[PDB]
Amino acid sequence: MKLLLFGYGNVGKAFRKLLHEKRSPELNDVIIGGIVTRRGIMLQDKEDFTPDLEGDVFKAFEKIKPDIIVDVSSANYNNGEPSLSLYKEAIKDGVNIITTNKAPLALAFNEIFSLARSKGVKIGFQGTVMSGTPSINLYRVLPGSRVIKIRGILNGTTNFILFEEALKEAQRRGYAEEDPTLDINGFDAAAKITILANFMIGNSVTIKDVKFEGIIKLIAYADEKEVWVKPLPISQDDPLYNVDGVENALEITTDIQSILIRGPGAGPVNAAYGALSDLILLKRDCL
Amino acid sequence: MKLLLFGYGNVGKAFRKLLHEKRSPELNDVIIGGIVTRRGIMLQDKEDFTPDLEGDVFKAFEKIKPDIIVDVSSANYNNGEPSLSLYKEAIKDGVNIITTNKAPLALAFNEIFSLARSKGVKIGFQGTVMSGTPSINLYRVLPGSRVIKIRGILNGTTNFILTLMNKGVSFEEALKEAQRRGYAEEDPTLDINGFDAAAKITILANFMIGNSVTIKDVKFEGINRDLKIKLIAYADEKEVWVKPLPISQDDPLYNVDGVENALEITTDIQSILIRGPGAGPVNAAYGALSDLILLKRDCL
Ligand SMILES: NC(=O)c1ccc[n+]([C@@H]2O[C@H](COP(=O)([O-])OP(=O)(O)OC[C@H]3O[C@@H](n4cnc5c(N)ncnc54)[C@H](OP(=O)(O)O)[C@@H]3O)[C@@H](O)[C@H]2O)c1
Ligand SMILES: NC(=O)c1ccc[n+]([C@@H]2O[C@H](COP(=O)([O-])OP(=O)(O)OC[C@H]3O[C@@H](n4cnc5c(N)ncnc54)[C@H](OP(=O)(O)O)[C@@H]3O)[C@@H](O)[C@H]2O)c1
């Protein structure tokens, strides 16, 4: 099976490295047919990017005919393109999608997932929320339960900050978005809670419906009625108390119980492992 | 598909109820063919147990010919029986197993899982560790990652007793409350003396680290009134233990209080912690139900 790798920054390079470490027997048949950046299309799996052709992700898609697209490109919160149009075309063609790019999902979740479900196409999106720490995929192992509310710390960069020296270290460590105002001004946290509300609660929201601010903890919240992101004081008994540094946490409340998962919120290798986890699950037919 | 339900105490009853809530489309073809207690065999799905036949779990297996056994019976750490021999017969007959009963897996994990792998039979065992809080099933969504070490509070009953004693309640009243809530093992010495926690860390070491250990390999102690102290379980590639330890304020496990449990899993990629209710009949039954749905999805 052939992957098209869309993006080759820190996450894309880390993903290619993880694939080549041969971490699961069911990835033995998986090859990268092509890699696309802003600089063009490489129709080969190489450690170093050198373009073979000029052209965008649609040209690469037509040239390669991939079985799966792995989207690790920059978030475009303006309109989610070209990923939004690309996912739609891939789903129509029966091409599975694995993504760490929040933007098309933060803007158009219902449109994308409705189309996928109607076509029997699978979407892996673990890396969009808390990188490699099961979040999306945690919910996959909570079947037959109704999610009532969601609460968490969903942005790694800003939690690591909690100024100029802090950010600089975070950018050095690769935690930050290419546009780091997306981290600071809360877009990233709001995108993640949007994705979580859609998937787990079923509350069809876009990032436009979320009330949010920026950088006590930056708390993202969703229930059946509302979705928001705001700073709040935290109790000592509250399980979010000492989720500090790059750490992120997701508290899922159901009809049965409340559970919390905590882990590294950001980090290119962690994000890439999220996408890799989705790939293994796809291969097992468990997405 | 037909289930044989082995046991009908708090967990079994809660499981039956959850199945009847029809919580997933995967479960539409799933029926209980029989329920076994130490009072005999009920060849019917009913809220209250009344035996139709006298006989043990083996006789029930023969009479029902189930597609799946759900083991919610009492732990037997002396020898894991009759569950251990039952699992071996089931696997050989192509019968899948879902269990919340730790004993056979704490004694003979490699034997059971080797036999199962060879026959292509699936084993759900989420409920053996932290009830309905993904633990076993959390590791299922961490594929292609090597587990280096694990540390946690793995017994709800003793955590609940430690917390209440910190709140100035006697050990004796804290235990009675744990029992009233249905947190405790039928034999509460299994919780108190650390057997239950040791069983769980054994299972995790086997499943996640891949070392073929048994409960006899674990150095463990439990709790008493004489001792924040937390009953800490730990495993890595070289050692497995359970002991009550003083816990500092900055430790992620400091505020894991009451019946809450928590597991920190360190992989080659990352360190993660999951926390939630350690015990509770409905929580345990939900663990088993989660395994059932995953089994139907072919994702065990
Ligand atoms: N950083 C983290 O820790 C983390 C954790 C979870 C999720 N994520 C998500 O993962 C994604 C990638 O993160 P990253 O840190 O790897 O960013 P990055 O290092 O800037 O990589 C972005 C890659 O996408 C390519 N790209 C961007 N826009 C494109 C376009 N219009 N056409 C073709 N290629 C394009 C870039 O090409 P050039 O090489 O030519 O610039 C670059 O190779 C982001 O969406 C982010 O939100 C990141
Ligand atoms: N307590 C929790 O919240 C929790 C959480 C996770 C896992 N678990 C595990 O789940 C299991 C069941 O828990 P529970 O609270 O439901 O215990 P329980 O209330 O004591 O129920 C045990 C059931 O098994 C039956 N049984 C025991 N030995 C048997 C034998 N040799 N043959 C036939 N039937 C037998 C009992 O029959 P009678 O009714 O006739 O006595 C009873 O119906 C235990 O292994 C426990 O470790 C419990």
Author numbering:
A (entry chain B): 1 to 162, 171 to 223, 233 to 304
B (entry chain A): 1 to 227, 232 to 304
Reported in the publication:
From a structural analysis of the purified enzyme, binding of NADP+ and 1,4-butanediol (BU) to the enzyme was detected, even though NADP+ was not added during the crystallization. BU was found at the binding site for homoserine. This structure was designated the IM/NADP/BU structure. The immature enzyme, but not the mature enzyme, formed a complex that included NADP+, despite its absence during crystallization. This indicates that the opening to the substrate-binding pocket in the immature enzyme is not sufficient for substrate-binding, efficient catalytic turnover or release of NADP+. Arg38 forms two hydrogen bonds with Glu186 to enclose the bound NAD(P)+ within the ligand-bound structures (the IM/NADP/BU and M/NAD/Cys structures). These hydrogen bonds appear to stabilize the closed state of StHSD (the IM/NADP/BU structure) and support tight binding of NAD(P)+ within the nucleotide-binding pocket. The side chains of Arg38 and Arg39 form hydrogen bonds with the phosphate group at the 2′- position of the ribose moiety of NADP+, but not NAD+, within the ligand-bound structures. This tight binding of NADP+ can restrain turnover, resulting in the inactivation of the NADP+-bound immature enzyme. Disordered parts in the IM/NADP/BU structure are found in the flexible part or a part adjacent to the flexible part.
